[PDB]
Structure 1
Amino acid sequence: PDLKNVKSKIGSTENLKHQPGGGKVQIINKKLDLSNVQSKCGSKDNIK
């Protein structure tokens, strides 16, 4: 006898393209703007 060609069915041989692929993460951080800010009591200029 002869079998010519035969192969397995179905598993890890059909998976070899798809890893799958991974990704990327990031924070999750900010600031605030302070540029407007002055004190809200204010007598010391009255020295004038």
Structure 2
Amino acid sequence: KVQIINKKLDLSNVQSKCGSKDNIKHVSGGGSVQIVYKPVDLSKVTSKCGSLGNIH
């Protein structure tokens, strides 16, 4: 059989019979507590501009 794979950026997960226990028990803060659990961030924040002119 012929096979071709062409990936630019690979984070593919493949598992079989895999266990995973993750605990976060006791977190205290005097101020502001922030907990971010398994985030995935593909967000873009862009500002394109073509031909900007600032004459004085």
TM-score range, shorter chain: under 0.3
TM-score by length of 1: 0.18
Larger Rg belongs to? 1
Q: In proportion to residue count, which structure has more strand?
A: 2
